[PDB]
Amino acid sequence: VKLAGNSSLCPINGWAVYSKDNSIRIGSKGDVFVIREPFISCSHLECRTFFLTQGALLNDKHSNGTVKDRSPHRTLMSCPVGEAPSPYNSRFESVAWSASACHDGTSWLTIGISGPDNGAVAVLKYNGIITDTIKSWRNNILRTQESECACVNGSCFTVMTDGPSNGQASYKIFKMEKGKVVKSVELDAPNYHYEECSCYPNAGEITCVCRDNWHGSNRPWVSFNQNLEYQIGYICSGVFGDNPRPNDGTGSCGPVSSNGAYGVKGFSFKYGNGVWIGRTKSTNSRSGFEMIWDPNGWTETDSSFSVKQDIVAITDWSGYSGSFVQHPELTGLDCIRPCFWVELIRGRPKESTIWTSGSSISFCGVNSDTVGWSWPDGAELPFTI
Amino acid sequence: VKLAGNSSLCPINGWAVYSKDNSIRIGSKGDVFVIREPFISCSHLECRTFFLTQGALLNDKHSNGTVKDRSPHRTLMSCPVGEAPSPYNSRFESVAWSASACHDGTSWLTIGISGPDNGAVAVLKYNGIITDTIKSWRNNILRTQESECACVNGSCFTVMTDGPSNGQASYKIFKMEKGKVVKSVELDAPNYHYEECSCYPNAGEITCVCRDNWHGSNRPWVSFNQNLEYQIGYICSGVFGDNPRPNDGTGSCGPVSSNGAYGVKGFSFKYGNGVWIGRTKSTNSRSGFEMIWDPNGWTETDSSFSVKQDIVAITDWSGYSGSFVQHPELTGLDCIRPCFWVELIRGRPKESTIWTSGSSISFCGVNSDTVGWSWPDGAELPFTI
Amino acid sequence: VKLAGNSSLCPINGWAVYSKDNSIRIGSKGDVFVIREPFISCSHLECRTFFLTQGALLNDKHSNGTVKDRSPHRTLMSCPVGEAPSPYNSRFESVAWSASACHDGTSWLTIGISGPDNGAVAVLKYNGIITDTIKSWRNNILRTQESECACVNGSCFTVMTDGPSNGQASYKIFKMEKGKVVKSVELDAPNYHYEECSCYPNAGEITCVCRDNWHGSNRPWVSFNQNLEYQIGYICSGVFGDNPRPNDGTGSCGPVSSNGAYGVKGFSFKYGNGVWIGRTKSTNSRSGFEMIWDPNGWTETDSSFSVKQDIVAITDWSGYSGSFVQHPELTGLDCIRPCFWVELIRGRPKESTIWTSGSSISFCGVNSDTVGWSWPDGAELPFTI
Amino acid sequence: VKLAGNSSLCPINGWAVYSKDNSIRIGSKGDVFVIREPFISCSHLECRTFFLTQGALLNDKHSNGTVKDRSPHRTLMSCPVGEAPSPYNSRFESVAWSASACHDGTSWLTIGISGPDNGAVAVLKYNGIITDTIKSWRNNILRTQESECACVNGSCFTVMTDGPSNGQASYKIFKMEKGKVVKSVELDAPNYHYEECSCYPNAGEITCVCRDNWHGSNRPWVSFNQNLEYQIGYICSGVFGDNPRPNDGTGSCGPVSSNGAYGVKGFSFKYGNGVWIGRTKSTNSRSGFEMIWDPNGWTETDSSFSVKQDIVAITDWSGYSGSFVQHPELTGLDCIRPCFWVELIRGRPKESTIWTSGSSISFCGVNSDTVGWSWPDGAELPFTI
Ligand SMILES: CCC(CC)O[C@@H]1C=C(C(=O)O)C[C@H](N)[C@H]1NC(C)=O
Ligand SMILES: CCC(CC)O[C@@H]1C=C(C(=O)O)C[C@H](N)[C@H]1NC(C)=O
Ligand SMILES: CCC(CC)O[C@@H]1C=C(C(=O)O)C[C@H](N)[C@H]1NC(C)=O
Ligand SMILES: CCC(CC)O[C@@H]1C=C(C(=O)O)C[C@H](N)[C@H]1NC(C)=O
């Protein structure tokens, strides 16, 4: 039976460690895929880890310039959470250098994008079989979430971008049933910039917190009904969420220009006017990670907050981070539980190696107490190469 | 319940990437099988990749002269689509240096040929247990499809050749049920030459497009009803499908002798008087791949065609290619969906390695739009050896 | 249906070899996890081996200081009994450097403790999803069993410690249902020291034999009802079970102070006033192992016993050992079968390697005859390093 | 439902190849266990390969003196037929240096002997849980089949030996239900010698053809009803089946003393007064294998025969071989089908390496035709060592 998403986000006090895959430490010897853009998404029975491989293993020559981003060998595969991604435990999903995926209660929907930069195509699959296709409409790198999509009452939603990662680009929301596009709407978002959105379902509606790689240090959002009627904005909190970003201060409900000319994928959970913010600890590099609870931070502008919980130390490498949900039909709870993952990027451009790849760690909602600490990748570089 | 095959091929506009195993790039370090002759075939529940191993792994000494073709260690195995063939994820099917396979809706049927060249024997299995045997009748390398057989209303059919790959040889169509040959017929096709046929079910009948290794540059075909009543011909198009072959020009409905003394296994999908032709890009070697729609090309002699979709660039190695299907019981559609796979050969005799193996990529029908691009093997030879 | 735990320990005579994973001998080449603190636990259908990896593999550089005990990369995983723990056959369970686990008949309950020594938090999971959390109440290394928990009539119970591994500490017994803590009690055990308890169900109650690391050469025990009403004491048998320990002699029903300033993890099965004692053969190091039947050494003080059954020769490295149970719902028997496992520790600090890890062996109850022997680890150190 | 064993052996004309695992060729690089004494057995759903590992992998130092036979690290494991035995694809079964196993229609019954030569104990397991124990009764290496046991109407029977491999030893037949010994009888076989019997069910009774290591070149046999009422004898054919053995000549219905002071495990299928013999091609060493049809050869004494089918050239190493069956509940047939396997031993003592391991190949009855050929191991020694 389909996942009803009419339930609300579960109240919580902190975050508890859920998984850690040590893929990079293990891959030092083991046959572990070199990856990037990993993300967790759960069905009504299990939770999986999706990722984009480089069609090569760690410590092998084919792992060479795996910093390039888009290639013909890039593929989307999955394995159960906490496990190291290997050819011996990974399920093939699709050929792709940018992807998304979600479970509607019945079957899995995977979105993989491949092809050249001037005409990339999104192949949609439902239970492994191709159910639709979406071709680039601006011919400038059609790309997507790199985190799970959201399903509600049997419909799943996602967000895509086409155009410059440099300035005004085109943005679209898509609704799908059985992996087929039943409706789509382009957002009329002049001056906004949307990339790699982390979307979750709450009370029958979707909410997405994304990345402004053009000119924002704070994160932009988009929420919508099952008819794609939407609203847009930026988190007004002075506790800036992008990286790079400036020192905390006075935020704005609009794009914060200072230092937001690049970025990193992230997420945030909205509760009333409050927001849980996941962000790096550094303001310049993808180092460290922490969770901050700013009550009344979604609508106000100030750098004051209530709680902060360490996830990774400033001295250790972090990277992308996304949100993922647990539905009542998998949990037995009467609310939609929030969790998040963090990508731990090793290699280039920061480290002198011939390769780039990443590990993952994840946490979940919870009302019981927690603790901040540091759960870093742990590999010692360089490798035998 | 048995796969019904009374439906027609789904109408289509282009091809959407379905998978890429990256086995060779992965095998540089991973315990991946050395193979050749890989093909895809689906049941009413999953799609799998079959292939002929060389009882050895990549980058190991036993990988030596793996260019030999036939030997006692050659075995037919399978794993899920897109995954690299390895001993930790592959199901053993049969001992064979030539095979075929298809699912009738109930169980898998596998056909593996082993034994000496002067008296080979095909072993038929149904759900993993031997159900029949077919021994060579001409005593000269009994061989078969190297791709999926076709099943209709409980019956599965295949084609086998016995005799010279050099000139006139004998060809037989077999009809089976629960893996037992209930009927067969020897094709009265003087001056024709059949090999590595790609057969597919359509409107209750089978259609096979094969390879002329004796004297044809265009491909031969055979279609037949469930009682083995058949018709034979050659694709008349001036867009020659074999490799080697001559530059495009005036085709023929009979064997085009120029350059057809050799060949490569291939496929083609017939729609009315039109055909989707899959072929290499080079006219001499196994380089590149492309999809071509020549309406009225199945019966007409002209090198004019409508659409062209690139799959593999001329600068990269390709190889065998075959057709495979997605029945309604698996898809939910009301038509039989056409898909294809391409074998990417690396090593001897074109590269200076001590071995020969291959990777695979596959695509499927689709009405939505698509894009041409290039999805090559990507491994850099030579290996550590 | 829930595992009723109202049956009694089956009457037995000796122990029969159940399993041996040779993980270390195998990892010399294979991709085996470097581990410690392993233990078995069974459901109503299968038996698994749980363990705490070091987020690295044998014979790889990351295997370095794997002697350190606690780290962020330490994770709790599991695989079927007898199989070598590997990233290709292990299910991820939880991030932890101390754990426990058991099956209530319906789903698996896992307990993984992580975080800093001054603020560790226990993450309880039921069927893979977080259901409760427990933070350190004495801010001094919250730790647990390192062996299975015990479930009765739908409820599972475990024991945890917080405070000095050096002297008087704080001990608590928890009661959980579907992984949620419904009740907890602190033992009023002045002068006692509980650590790494082995608890088993019997006649509707729980019995634990633990490790006194503070000042006992004999072992302490706790037994309690389903409402956490309890009783405490020490095994009085002059056949001292802790290691190190003094030569056998006159025991005590309280802490035997000579040599018991350290210890190792163990177990014991109480029968009437008698006991089956598992122990190392050495009085000083974790060398050798043997089972001893002191009929009524549970309450009596005399170093005399009836049967001795060798499990590992004095010349070979041994280590931790714990109890694990079969239930009637799994076995079909009408009694609770006792079984135990043994950790074979190789590496530091006794051998000159840069790492520490371990193999496992197990035995089960049984009435028919048996024989003692020696089933050591068998790996030859050092390794390629 | 239980496997009725009331049907008779299926009439056959030759033997078709069923599988080949290439375990050693693959092990050159892959993580393949080192093993000996492999054998196949089938349930009502699938066929598996059991084997006794040496607790190490090929091409690793721990693969050293793996020629010793018995050791504490020896374990019984299994994987699907055709697959190379590895720690990634192998199910653990029991600790043993001698074993047997069979499926009764409901669950697997495994038999694993371990312990010292003067007190070995066989641990029986039903569905993975210990159901009985049998201790040595002569204190001289209790040993068993090293192939599959036979099940009929819900009962499985096996054969065990205790005593000298040097002369008169004690032989016993065991009958078990759900893994528990319900009856047992000791054979009154003076001047007979039974070891490593291959037993198959037929018309509700069991027939075993074994190895005489004492003083016989021909093979001894025992057949018995479901109440262990039995009959013994020796195959009378002058086509001697043991190895070593003298050149073919005049056989004997009793022990043929010339050259039978040692031997190898083998098998045979009796049809009326005829027999299908499996044997090596060489009379001195375990080289080559072949099937021979000697009608009226079970009771007569002559070296003449009707059919001979080659399985392994004399130029290549063979080794143990045994029988296995496929019941009607698996095949759908109305008769019990005969098949067999052959162990291809490589290394010591015939080859200069530091190890000993084996590969496997198997065949099945079949009415259709077949062919003789040579399917050897194919590994090139020595290895990197
Ligand atoms: C094309 C711009 C896009 C959005 C900023 O770049 C991403 C940034 C990345 C990054 O900043 O690390 C890595 C992503 N793999 C890349 N996505 C693609 C499709 O190339
Ligand atoms: C024997 C002739 C036959 C048909 C052309 O050769 C094939 C051509 C091949 C090729 O052109 O690459 C490889 C196939 N492995 C081989 N088949 C067998 C059975 O050896
Ligand atoms: C903190 C004291 C505790 C009980 C004695 O130490 C254990 C002893 C050990 C040992 O004596 O070998 C190894 C365990 N990994 C360790 N547990 C933790 C959590 O560090
Ligand atoms: C102990 C005598 C017995 C029967 C002849 O020896 C077998 C012969 C063998 C052989 O001749 O190769 C190998 C078996 N692994 C061995 N079995 C045991 C248990 O040691």
Coordinates of all heavy atoms in Angstrom, one line a residue, chain B residues 27 29-31 33 54-55 57-58 60-62 72-73 88 90 92 95 114-116 119 121 125 128-130 132-133 135, chain D residues 16 18-20 22 25-26 28-31 81-83 86 88 330 337 366 368-369 371 373-376 378-380 382:
Chain B
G27 N 37.5 -4.7 -13.0 CA 38.4 -5.9 -12.9 C 39.9 -5.7 -12.8 O 40.6 -6.6 -12.6
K29 N 41.4 -4.4 -10.5 CA 41.7 -4.7 -9.2 C 40.7 -5.7 -8.6 O 41.1 -6.6 -7.8 CB 41.7 -3.5 -8.3 CG 41.8 -3.8 -6.8 CD 41.6 -2.6 -5.9 CE 41.6 -3.1 -4.4 NZ 41.3 -2.0 -3.3
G30 N 39.4 -5.7 -9.0 CA 38.4 -6.6 -8.5 C 38.4 -8.0 -9.1 O 38.9 -8.2 -10.2
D31 N 37.9 -8.9 -8.4 CA 37.8 -10.3 -8.8 C 36.6 -10.5 -9.8 O 35.6 -11.0 -9.4 CB 37.7 -11.3 -7.6 CG 38.8 -11.1 -6.6 OD1 39.9 -10.8 -7.1 OD2 38.6 -11.3 -5.4
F33 N 35.2 -11.8 -13.6 CA 35.4 -12.8 -14.6 C 35.9 -12.2 -15.9 O 35.6 -11.1 -16.3 CB 34.1 -13.6 -14.9 CG 33.8 -14.7 -13.9 CD1 32.7 -14.6 -13.1 CD2 34.7 -15.8 -13.8 CE1 32.4 -15.7 -12.2 CE2 34.4 -16.8 -12.9 CZ 33.3 -16.8 -12.1
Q54 N 35.7 -17.6 -19.0 CA 36.8 -18.3 -19.5 C 37.5 -19.0 -18.3 O 38.7 -19.3 -18.2 CB 37.8 -17.3 -20.1 CG 37.4 -16.7 -21.4 CD 37.7 -17.7 -22.6 OE1 38.0 -18.9 -22.4 NE2 37.5 -17.2 -23.8
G55 N 36.6 -19.2 -17.2 CA 37.1 -19.9 -16.0 C 38.4 -19.2 -15.5 O 39.2 -19.9 -14.9
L57 N 40.1 -15.0 -14.0 CA 39.8 -13.6 -13.6 C 40.7 -12.7 -14.4 O 41.8 -13.0 -14.9 CB 40.0 -13.5 -12.1 CG 39.1 -14.4 -11.2 CD1 39.4 -14.0 -9.7 CD2 37.7 -14.2 -11.5
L58 N 40.3 -11.4 -14.4 CA 41.1 -10.4 -15.0 C 42.3 -10.1 -14.2 O 42.3 -10.1 -13.0 CB 40.2 -9.1 -15.2 CG 39.0 -9.2 -16.0 CD1 38.0 -8.0 -15.8 CD2 39.4 -9.3 -17.5
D60 N 45.0 -11.8 -13.9 CA 45.5 -13.1 -13.4 C 46.2 -13.8 -14.5 O 45.7 -13.7 -15.7 CB 44.5 -13.9 -12.7 CG 45.0 -15.2 -12.1 OD1 46.0 -15.1 -11.3 OD2 44.5 -16.3 -12.5
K61 N 47.1 -14.7 -14.3 CA 47.8 -15.4 -15.3 C 46.9 -16.3 -16.1 O 47.1 -16.5 -17.3 CB 49.0 -16.2 -14.8 CG 48.7 -17.2 -13.8 CD 50.0 -17.9 -13.4 CE 49.6 -19.1 -12.5 NZ 50.9 -19.9 -12.1
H62 N 45.9 -16.9 -15.5 CA 45.0 -17.8 -16.2 C 44.2 -17.1 -17.2 O 43.4 -17.7 -17.9 CB 44.1 -18.5 -15.2 CG 44.8 -19.3 -14.2 ND1 45.3 -20.6 -14.5 CD2 45.1 -19.1 -12.9 CE1 45.9 -21.1 -13.5 NE2 45.8 -20.2 -12.5
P72 N 37.4 -26.4 -22.5 CA 36.7 -27.1 -21.5 C 36.3 -26.3 -20.2 O 35.4 -26.7 -19.5 CB 37.6 -28.2 -21.1 CG 38.4 -28.4 -22.3 CD 38.7 -27.0 -22.8
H73 N 36.9 -25.1 -20.0 CA 36.7 -24.3 -18.9 C 35.6 -23.2 -19.1 O 35.2 -22.5 -18.1 CB 38.0 -23.7 -18.4 CG 39.1 -24.7 -18.4 ND1 40.3 -24.5 -19.1 CD2 39.2 -25.9 -17.8 CE1 41.0 -25.6 -19.0 NE2 40.4 -26.4 -18.2
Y88 N 31.4 -14.0 -6.9 CA 30.7 -13.7 -5.6 C 29.3 -13.2 -5.9 O 28.6 -12.9 -4.9 CB 31.5 -12.7 -4.8 CG 33.0 -12.9 -4.8 CD1 33.8 -11.8 -5.0 CD2 33.5 -14.1 -4.7 CE1 35.2 -11.9 -5.0 CE2 34.9 -14.3 -4.7 CZ 35.7 -13.2 -4.8 OH 37.1 -13.4 -4.9
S90 N 27.7 -14.2 -9.2 CA 27.2 -14.9 -10.4 C 26.7 -16.3 -10.1 O 27.2 -17.1 -9.4 CB 28.4 -15.0 -11.4 OG 28.7 -13.7 -11.9
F92 N 25.8 -20.0 -11.4 CA 26.3 -20.9 -12.4 C 25.1 -21.5 -13.2 O 24.1 -21.9 -12.6 CB 27.1 -22.1 -11.8 CG 27.6 -23.1 -12.8 CD1 28.8 -22.9 -13.4 CD2 26.8 -24.2 -13.2 CE1 29.2 -23.8 -14.4 CE2 27.2 -25.1 -14.2 CZ 28.5 -24.9 -14.8
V95 N 28.0 -25.6 -18.4 CA 29.3 -25.6 -18.9 C 29.1 -25.3 -20.4 O 28.4 -26.1 -21.1 CB 30.0 -27.0 -18.7 CG1 31.3 -27.0 -19.5 CG2 30.2 -27.3 -17.3
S114 N 28.9 -27.8 -25.2 CA 30.3 -28.2 -24.8 C 30.7 -29.4 -25.6 O 30.0 -29.9 -26.5 CB 30.4 -28.4 -23.3 OG 31.8 -28.3 -22.9
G115 N 31.9 -29.9 -25.4 CA 32.4 -31.0 -26.1 C 33.3 -30.6 -27.2 O 33.6 -29.4 -27.4
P116 N 33.8 -31.6 -28.0 CA 34.8 -31.3 -29.1 C 34.1 -30.7 -30.3 O 32.9 -30.9 -30.5 CB 35.4 -32.7 -29.4 CG 34.2 -33.6 -29.2 CD 33.5 -33.0 -28.0
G119 N 31.8 -33.0 -32.5 CA 30.7 -33.7 -31.9 C 30.1 -33.1 -30.6 O 29.9 -33.7 -29.6
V121 N 27.7 -31.1 -27.9 CA 26.4 -31.4 -27.4 C 25.8 -30.3 -26.6 O 26.4 -29.7 -25.7 CB 26.4 -32.7 -26.6 CG1 27.4 -32.7 -25.6 CG2 25.0 -32.8 -25.9
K125 N 18.5 -27.0 -20.0 CA 18.1 -27.1 -18.6 C 16.8 -26.2 -18.4 O 16.6 -25.3 -19.1 CB 19.2 -26.5 -17.7 CG 20.4 -27.4 -17.5 CD 21.5 -26.8 -16.7 CE 22.7 -27.7 -16.6 NZ 23.8 -27.2 -15.7
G128 N 17.3 -25.1 -13.9 CA 18.5 -25.7 -13.4 C 18.7 -27.2 -13.6 O 19.8 -27.7 -13.2
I129 N 17.7 -27.9 -14.1 CA 17.9 -29.3 -14.3 C 17.8 -29.8 -15.7 O 16.9 -29.4 -16.5 CB 16.8 -30.1 -13.4 CG1 15.4 -29.7 -13.8 CG2 17.0 -29.7 -11.9 CD1 14.4 -29.8 -12.7
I130 N 18.7 -30.6 -16.2 CA 18.7 -31.1 -17.5 C 17.4 -31.7 -18.0 O 16.9 -32.6 -17.3 CB 19.9 -32.1 -17.7 CG1 21.2 -31.5 -17.4 CG2 19.9 -32.6 -19.1 CD1 22.4 -32.4 -17.6
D132 N 16.9 -32.1 -21.7 CA 17.1 -32.6 -23.0 C 18.5 -32.4 -23.5 O 19.3 -31.8 -22.8 CB 16.1 -32.0 -24.1 CG 15.8 -33.0 -25.2 OD1 16.5 -34.0 -25.4 OD2 14.9 -32.7 -26.0
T133 N 18.8 -33.0 -24.7 CA 20.2 -32.9 -25.2 C 20.1 -32.9 -26.7 O 19.2 -33.6 -27.3 CB 21.0 -34.0 -24.7 OG1 21.9 -33.6 -23.6 CG2 21.9 -34.6 -25.8
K135 N 22.8 -33.2 -30.0 CA 24.1 -33.4 -30.4 C 24.3 -33.0 -31.9 O 23.3 -33.0 -32.6 CB 24.5 -34.9 -30.3 CG 23.4 -35.9 -30.6 CD 23.9 -37.3 -30.7 CE 22.7 -38.3 -30.9 NZ 21.8 -38.4 -29.7
Chain D
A16 N 25.6 -36.3 -19.4 CA 25.7 -35.0 -19.9 C 26.3 -34.1 -18.8 O 26.1 -34.2 -17.6 CB 24.3 -34.4 -20.2
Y18 N 27.1 -31.3 -16.2 CA 26.1 -30.6 -15.4 C 26.8 -29.3 -14.9 O 26.2 -28.2 -14.9 CB 25.6 -31.4 -14.2 CG 24.5 -30.9 -13.5 CD1 23.3 -30.5 -14.1 CD2 24.5 -30.7 -12.1 CE1 22.2 -30.0 -13.5 CE2 23.4 -30.2 -11.4 CZ 22.3 -29.8 -12.1 OH 21.2 -29.3 -11.4
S19 N 28.1 -29.4 -14.5 CA 28.8 -28.2 -13.9 C 30.3 -28.3 -13.8 O 30.9 -29.3 -13.9 CB 28.2 -27.9 -12.5 OG 28.6 -28.9 -11.6
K20 N 30.9 -27.1 -13.6 CA 32.3 -27.0 -13.5 C 32.6 -25.7 -12.7 O 32.2 -24.6 -13.2 CB 33.0 -27.0 -14.9 CG 34.5 -27.0 -14.8 CD 35.2 -27.1 -16.2 CE 36.6 -27.6 -16.1 NZ 37.5 -26.7 -15.3
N22 N 35.7 -24.4 -11.7 CA 37.0 -23.8 -12.0 C 37.6 -23.1 -10.8 O 38.5 -22.2 -10.9 CB 36.9 -22.7 -13.1 CG 36.7 -23.3 -14.5 OD1 35.7 -23.1 -15.2 ND2 37.7 -24.1 -14.9
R25 N 41.6 -22.3 -10.9 CA 42.0 -21.3 -11.9 C 41.7 -19.9 -11.3 O 42.5 -19.0 -11.3 CB 41.3 -21.5 -13.2 CG 41.8 -22.7 -14.0 CD 40.9 -23.1 -15.1 NE 40.6 -22.0 -16.1 CZ 41.3 -21.6 -17.1 NH1 42.4 -22.3 -17.4 NH2 41.0 -20.6 -17.9
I26 N 40.5 -19.8 -10.8 CA 39.9 -18.6 -10.2 C 40.7 -18.2 -9.0 O 41.0 -17.0 -8.8 CB 38.4 -18.8 -9.9 CG1 37.7 -19.0 -11.2 CG2 37.9 -17.5 -9.2 CD1 36.2 -19.3 -11.0
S28 N 43.6 -18.4 -8.3 CA 44.9 -17.9 -8.5 C 44.9 -16.4 -8.0 O 45.9 -15.9 -7.5 CB 45.2 -17.9 -10.0 OG 46.5 -17.4 -10.3
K29 N 43.8 -15.8 -8.2 CA 43.6 -14.4 -7.8 C 42.5 -14.2 -6.7 O 42.7 -13.5 -5.7 CB 43.3 -13.5 -9.0 CG 43.0 -12.1 -8.6 CD 42.7 -11.2 -9.7 CE 42.3 -9.8 -9.2 NZ 41.6 -9.0 -10.2
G30 N 41.3 -14.8 -7.0 CA 40.2 -14.6 -6.1 C 40.3 -15.2 -4.7 O 41.2 -16.0 -4.5
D31 N 39.4 -14.9 -3.9 CA 39.4 -15.4 -2.5 C 38.6 -16.7 -2.4 O 37.5 -16.8 -1.9 CB 38.8 -14.4 -1.5 CG 39.4 -13.0 -1.6 OD1 40.7 -12.9 -1.7 OD2 38.7 -12.0 -1.7
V81 N 25.9 -25.2 -6.8 CA 26.7 -25.9 -7.8 C 27.2 -25.0 -8.9 O 26.5 -24.2 -9.4 CB 25.9 -27.1 -8.4 CG1 25.9 -28.3 -7.5 CG2 24.5 -26.7 -8.7
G82 N 28.5 -25.3 -9.2 CA 29.1 -24.5 -10.3 C 29.9 -23.3 -9.8 O 30.8 -22.8 -10.5
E83 N 29.6 -22.8 -8.6 CA 30.3 -21.7 -8.0 C 31.5 -22.1 -7.3 O 31.6 -23.1 -6.7 CB 29.3 -20.9 -7.1 CG 28.2 -20.1 -7.8 CD 27.3 -19.5 -6.9 OE1 27.7 -19.1 -5.7 OE2 26.1 -19.3 -7.2
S86 N 34.0 -19.8 -1.7 CA 34.6 -18.6 -1.2 C 33.9 -18.2 0.1 O 32.7 -18.6 0.4 CB 34.5 -17.5 -2.2 OG 34.3 -16.2 -1.6
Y88 N 32.7 -15.6 0.7 CA 31.7 -14.6 0.3 C 30.4 -15.3 -0.3 O 29.3 -14.7 -0.3 CB 32.3 -13.7 -0.8 CG 33.6 -13.1 -0.5 CD1 34.5 -12.8 -1.5 CD2 34.0 -12.9 0.9 CE1 35.8 -12.3 -1.1 CE2 35.2 -12.4 1.2 CZ 36.1 -12.1 0.2 OH 37.4 -11.6 0.5
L330 N 11.9 -32.9 -7.3 CA 12.8 -31.8 -7.7 C 12.7 -31.7 -9.2 O 12.6 -30.6 -9.8 CB 14.2 -32.0 -7.4 CG 15.2 -31.2 -8.1 CD1 15.0 -29.7 -7.8 CD2 16.7 -31.6 -7.8
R337 N 16.7 -39.9 -10.7 CA 17.8 -39.6 -11.7 C 19.2 -39.7 -11.1 O 19.5 -39.2 -10.1 CB 17.6 -38.3 -12.3 CG 18.9 -37.7 -12.9 CD 18.8 -36.4 -13.7 NE 18.1 -36.6 -14.9 CZ 17.8 -35.7 -15.8 NH1 18.2 -34.4 -15.6 NH2 17.2 -36.0 -17.0
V366 N 20.5 -38.9 -18.2 CA 20.1 -38.5 -19.6 C 19.9 -39.7 -20.6 O 20.6 -40.7 -20.6 CB 21.2 -37.6 -20.2 CG1 21.1 -37.5 -21.7 CG2 21.0 -36.2 -19.6
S368 N 18.9 -38.8 -24.0 CA 19.5 -38.3 -25.3 C 20.9 -38.6 -25.4 O 21.5 -39.2 -24.5 CB 19.2 -36.8 -25.3 OG 19.0 -36.3 -24.0
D369 N 21.6 -38.3 -26.5 CA 23.0 -38.6 -26.5 C 24.0 -37.7 -25.8 O 23.6 -36.7 -25.2 CB 23.5 -38.9 -27.9 CG 24.8 -39.8 -28.0 OD1 24.9 -40.7 -27.1 OD2 25.6 -39.7 -28.9
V371 N 28.6 -37.1 -25.2 CA 29.9 -37.2 -25.9 C 31.0 -37.3 -24.9 O 30.9 -36.8 -23.7 CB 30.2 -36.0 -26.8 CG1 29.3 -36.1 -28.1 CG2 29.9 -34.7 -26.1
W373 N 34.9 -36.5 -23.8 CA 35.8 -35.4 -24.0 C 36.6 -35.3 -22.7 O 36.7 -36.2 -21.9 CB 35.0 -34.1 -24.2 CG 35.8 -33.0 -25.0 CD1 36.8 -33.3 -25.9 CD2 35.8 -31.6 -24.8 NE1 37.3 -32.1 -26.4 CE2 36.7 -31.0 -25.7 CE3 35.0 -30.8 -24.0 CZ2 36.9 -29.7 -25.8 CZ3 35.2 -29.4 -24.1 CH2 36.1 -28.9 -25.0
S374 N 37.3 -34.1 -22.5 CA 38.1 -33.9 -21.3 C 37.9 -32.6 -20.7 O 38.2 -31.5 -21.3 CB 39.6 -34.1 -21.6 OG 40.4 -33.8 -20.5
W375 N 37.3 -32.6 -19.5 CA 37.0 -31.3 -18.7 C 37.9 -31.3 -17.5 O 37.4 -31.6 -16.4 CB 35.6 -31.3 -18.3 CG 34.6 -31.1 -19.4 CD1 34.2 -29.9 -19.9 CD2 33.9 -32.1 -20.1 NE1 33.3 -30.1 -20.9 CE2 33.1 -31.4 -21.0 CE3 33.8 -33.5 -20.0 CZ2 32.2 -32.1 -21.9 CZ3 33.0 -34.2 -20.9 CH2 32.2 -33.5 -21.8
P376 N 39.2 -31.0 -17.6 CA 40.1 -31.0 -16.5 C 40.1 -29.7 -15.7 O 39.5 -28.7 -16.1 CB 41.5 -31.3 -17.1 CG 41.4 -30.5 -18.3 CD 39.9 -30.8 -18.8
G378 N 42.5 -27.5 -15.3 CA 43.1 -26.3 -16.1 C 43.9 -25.3 -15.4 O 44.3 -24.3 -16.0
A379 N 44.3 -25.5 -14.1 CA 45.1 -24.6 -13.4 C 46.6 -24.9 -13.7 O 47.0 -26.0 -13.8 CB 44.9 -24.7 -11.9
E380 N 47.4 -23.8 -13.9 CA 48.8 -24.1 -14.2 C 49.6 -23.9 -13.0 O 49.7 -22.8 -12.4 CB 49.3 -23.2 -15.4 CG 49.3 -21.7 -15.2 CD 50.3 -21.0 -16.1 OE1 51.5 -21.1 -15.9 OE2 49.8 -20.3 -17.1
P382 N 53.4 -24.2 -10.8 CA 53.1 -23.8 -9.4 C 52.5 -22.4 -9.4 O 52.5 -21.7 -10.4 CB 54.4 -23.9 -8.7 CG 55.4 -23.5 -9.7 CD 54.9 -24.2 -11.0

